Design a protein around this ligand. Structure first.
Ligand SMILES: [Mg+2]
Ligand SMILES: [Mg+2]
Ligand SMILES: [Mg+2]
Ligand SMILES: [Mg+2]
Ligand SMILES: [Mg+2]
Ligand SMILES: [Mg+2]
Ligand SMILES: [Mg+2]
Ligand SMILES: [Mg+2]
Ligand SMILES: [Mg+2]
Ligand SMILES: [Mg+2]
Ligand SMILES: [Mg+2]
Ligand SMILES: [Mg+2]
Ligand SMILES: [Mg+2]
Ligand SMILES: [Mg+2]
Ligand SMILES: [Mg+2]
Ligand SMILES: [Mg+2]
Ligand SMILES: [Mg+2]
Ligand SMILES: [Mg+2]
Ligand SMILES: [Mg+2]
Ligand SMILES: [Mg+2]
Ligand SMILES: [Mg+2]
Ligand SMILES: [Mg+2]
Ligand SMILES: [Mg+2]
Ligand SMILES: [Mg+2]
Ligand SMILES: [Mg+2]
Ligand SMILES: [Mg+2]
Ligand SMILES: [Mg+2]
Ligand SMILES: [Mg+2]
Ligand SMILES: [Mg+2]
Ligand SMILES: [Mg+2]
Ligand SMILES: [Mg+2]
Ligand SMILES: [Mg+2]
Ligand SMILES: [Mg+2]
Ligand SMILES: [Mg+2]
Ligand SMILES: [Mg+2]
Ligand SMILES: [Mg+2]
Ligand SMILES: [Mg+2]
Ligand SMILES: [Mg+2]
Ligand SMILES: [Mg+2]
Ligand SMILES: [Mg+2]
Ligand SMILES: [Mg+2]
Ligand SMILES: [Mg+2]
Ligand SMILES: [Mg+2]
Ligand SMILES: [Mg+2]
Ligand SMILES: [Mg+2]
Ligand SMILES: [Mg+2]
Ligand SMILES: [Mg+2]
Ligand SMILES: [Mg+2]
Ligand SMILES: [Mg+2]
Ligand SMILES: [Mg+2]
Ligand SMILES: [Mg+2]
Ligand SMILES: [Mg+2]
Ligand SMILES: [Mg+2]
Ligand SMILES: [Mg+2]
Ligand SMILES: [Mg+2]
Ligand SMILES: [Mg+2]
Ligand SMILES: [Mg+2]
Ligand SMILES: [Mg+2]
Lengths: 112, 137, 116, 52, 101
RNA sequence: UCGGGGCUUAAGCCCAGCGCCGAAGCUGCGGGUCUGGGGGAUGACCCCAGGCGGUAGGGGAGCGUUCCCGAUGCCGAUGAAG
RNA sequence: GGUGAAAAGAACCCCGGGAGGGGAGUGAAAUAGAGCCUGAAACCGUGGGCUUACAAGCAGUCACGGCCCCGCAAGGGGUUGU
């Protein structure tokens, strides 16, 4: 058994959040919660929030037990980018990419 | 399909060096260094005999060579071309003279270097008294 | 009647790019592959002719390293056979040096006497 | 745009490689006297308080 | 019984019956063909003349068939020139039977 | 630094000899294609000899895309195109 | 420019401030879920197999060997050590 959770269209850069996710991949749920708590990064907040809901789904829809689940796997995916102009000296105009992310987290029953 | 060899125990050898002409010796040493003498030869695998030499200082060399022969050590730095004549080599570490001759006659590749290991050289004699020692000439 | 490019080009591409699978970087992910395949094709056809010379020499060494053990030059050896009139030992099957040494040995003796 | 300019597109391999030491490192935490809660060493903490 | 035999321009050793693949021949599907060509044997059949005199290895033409399609392809640079050409060699399935010298 | 190692009654130079290595040359075995000759009355297919590096170029024979006749047809949910 | 035959366009519960998900439900189909048919390529990512820290390279090719993978074997696929 496994419990998914997906945050689509998160205004935050993939490379950036990948770092945070990479911290918690394959960790005990309670262990992760703490990492995200005191880890110094914007990406944490987003990953934590999806991680947190990943648990709720594990419990309220998949009969899983909070005290026994972990991060079977997780990963962020790159979604559409918001292109924006940018006035540059001498007339040059540059397009800046405010990218977006698709954070995925999946939990799982430990062992027996 | 030609014969496909398999694991073989390293055949060691003991070689003298007194009076032996530097190069003429180095040739054989090289040829025995790679398993190129044994008919079960395979360039791919590399299974040459462990040649061990003794009495290095004894090496002969024809004509003006102790005085003429020059060795080049280039360091990365300017004017680091530092060059040393043959006589000086036998003064310092004499084993070098035979090494820098054998090394030159081994192939250039990675296993060629793996072969340079099979070669042991001293002047005494008195090798590390291991086990094998099949003398030769 | 207009005739779009349609499927045609896409198939021609992936067709090649399939051949080029296993290569390095863009070299196996684009029209770079083509260039790579050109070089490969020419390499094979040349390394085909090479493969012959490869084993020619591969064997020779073995033979020479073998009869030199009995005590003679590969050149000496062969000359005896060419004289003895025994096309038998095709240099490939001179690999007897490892399989059935004795047969090789008697072949040697034949060459010894065949010479003089 | 000026003098210094990348001579070649850096391969994806050579790219990822440079980002070798780029990886993050987990925070350091320890159980407190009060709650079982995990505090970072040498610190106070909310929902736990402290002494002296 | 290491008996050599030249056939198809190339020659090879032959075991007491075994599956072997040789150059194409004009034999029936599953018939029998004798290779008067023979060199050496199990007990040192020294081949006096080029080929051993009274002796022969026989084998059953197990069947014919083409083989793997190797791909020859020429290319010269700076000069529009490329030739794609497929080629698959034929070969008979000689199953060795008799090895009587 | 002679390509390097290394070489001195040579691993150098001259003179005489035998042997061997060595190309995609030549031979062997198999297969293409074309041209020529034959069998064959013949079409047909088989056999024999020869040619077949190639840019600008000239010549020949094919493959695929779109559309029309063949279609009031035929394939198609037991699955069309992609 | 194009959901589906029909809006049947996802009530209600759960996480979340929201966005977005997870169940449930509609539907033949929901990786047909709403700039939604099909959904290629470059490009980014997760998991697995082979591999790499004495090594010199237009990145391939030829050979042998090792490891994993389809088959009983003969064979074949993937990877790369020399
Ligand atoms: Mg990235
Ligand atoms: Mg909870
Ligand atoms: Mg500015
Ligand atoms: Mg840009
Ligand atoms: Mg002494
Ligand atoms: Mg200087
Ligand atoms: Mg100076
Ligand atoms: Mg020792
Ligand atoms: Mg001892
Ligand atoms: Mg076009
Ligand atoms: Mg040869
Ligand atoms: Mg660069
Ligand atoms: Mg990568
Ligand atoms: Mg990476
Ligand atoms: Mg404190
Ligand atoms: Mg207190
Ligand atoms: Mg007979
Ligand atoms: Mg096949
Ligand atoms: Mg060129
Ligand atoms: Mg030289
Ligand atoms: Mg020169
Ligand atoms: Mg002369
Ligand atoms: Mg004369
Ligand atoms: Mg002459
Ligand atoms: Mg001469
Ligand atoms: Mg003579
Ligand atoms: Mg003669
Ligand atoms: Mg003569
Ligand atoms: Mg001669
Ligand atoms: Mg020719
Ligand atoms: Mg004709
Ligand atoms: Mg007729
Ligand atoms: Mg007619
Ligand atoms: Mg012809
Ligand atoms: Mg149209
Ligand atoms: Mg019409
Ligand atoms: Mg249906
Ligand atoms: Mg179907
Ligand atoms: Mg189907
Ligand atoms: Mg169409
Ligand atoms: Mg079509
Ligand atoms: Mg519809
Ligand atoms: Mg609508
Ligand atoms: Mg409508
Ligand atoms: Mg939604
Ligand atoms: Mg559902
Ligand atoms: Mg469904
Ligand atoms: Mg769904
Ligand atoms: Mg897909
Ligand atoms: Mg659909
Ligand atoms: Mg959806
Ligand atoms: Mg939406
Ligand atoms: Mg439709
Ligand atoms: Mg991307
Ligand atoms: Mg990017
Ligand atoms: Mg390397
Ligand atoms: Mg079975
Ligand atoms: Mg097969």
């Amino acid at each position: 058994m496994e419990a998914k959770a997906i945050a689509r269209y998160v205004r935050i850069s993939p490379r950036k959040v990948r770092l945070v996710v990479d911290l918690i991949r394959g960790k005990s749920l309670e262990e992760a919660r703490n990492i995200l708590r005191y880890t110094n990064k914007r990406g944490a907040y987003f990953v934590a929030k999806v991680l947190e809901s990943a648990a709720a789904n594990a419990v309220n829809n998949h009969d899983m037990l909070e005290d026994r689940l972990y991060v079977k796997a997780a990963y962020v995916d790159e979604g559409p980018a918001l292109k924006r102009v940018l006035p540059r000296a001498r007339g040059r105009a540059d397009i800046i990419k405010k990218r977006t992310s698709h954070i995925t987290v999946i939990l799982g029953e430990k062992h027996g | 399909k030609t014969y496909v060899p398999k694991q073989v125990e390293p055949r060691w050898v003991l070689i003298d060096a007194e009076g032996k002409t530097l190069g003429r010796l180095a040739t054989k040493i090289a040829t025995l260094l790679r398993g190129k003498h044994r008919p079960d030869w395979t360039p791919n695998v590399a299974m040459g005999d462990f040649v061990v030499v003794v009495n290095a200082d004894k090496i002969r060399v024809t004509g003006k060579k102790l005085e003429q022969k020059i060795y080049t050590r280039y360091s990365g730095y300017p004017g680091g071309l530092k060059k040393i004549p043959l006589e000086k080599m036998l003064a310092t570490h004499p084993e070098r003279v035979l090494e820098h001759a054998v090394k030159g006659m081994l192939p250039k590749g990675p296993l060629g270097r793996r072969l340079f290991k099979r070669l042991k050289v001293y002047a005494g004699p008195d090798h590390p008294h291991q086990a094998q020692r099949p003398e030769k000439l | 009647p207009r005739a779009k490019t349609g499927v045609v080009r896409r198939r021609k591409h992936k067709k090649i790019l399939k051949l080029a699978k296993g290569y390095w970087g863009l070299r196996s992910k684009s029209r770079k592959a083509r260039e790579t395949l050109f070089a490969a094709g020419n390499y094979a056809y040349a390394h085909r002719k090479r493969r012959k010379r490869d084993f020619r020499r591969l064997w020779i060494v073995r033979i020479n390293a073998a009869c030199r053990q009995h005590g003679l030059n590969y050149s000496t050896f062969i000359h005896g056979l060419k004289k003895a009139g025994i096309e038998v030992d095709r240099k490939n099957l001179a690999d007897l040096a490892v399989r059935e040494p004795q047969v090789f040995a008697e072949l040697v003796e034949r060459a010894k006497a065949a010479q003089g | 745009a000026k003098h210094p300019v990348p001579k070649k597109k850096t391969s994806k391999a050579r790219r990822d490689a440079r980002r070798s030491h780029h990886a993050l490192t987990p925070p350091i935490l320890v159980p407190c006297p009060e709650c079982k809660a995990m505090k970072p060493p040498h610190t106070v903490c909310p929902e736990c308080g402290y002494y002296a | 019984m290491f008996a050599i035999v030249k056939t198809g321009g190339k020659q090879y050793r032959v075991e007491p019956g075994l599956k072997l693949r040789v150059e194409k021949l004009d034999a029936e599907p599953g018939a029998t063909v004798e290779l008067p060509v023979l060199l050496l044997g199990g007990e040192k059949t020294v081949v006096g003349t080029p080929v051993v005199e009274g002796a022969s290895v026989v084998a059953e033409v197990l069947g014919h068939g083409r083989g793997k399609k190797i791909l020859v392809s020429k290319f010269k640079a700076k000069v529009q020139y490329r030739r794609k050409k497929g080629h698959r060699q034929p070969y008979t399935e000689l199953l060795i039977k008799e090895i009587r010298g």
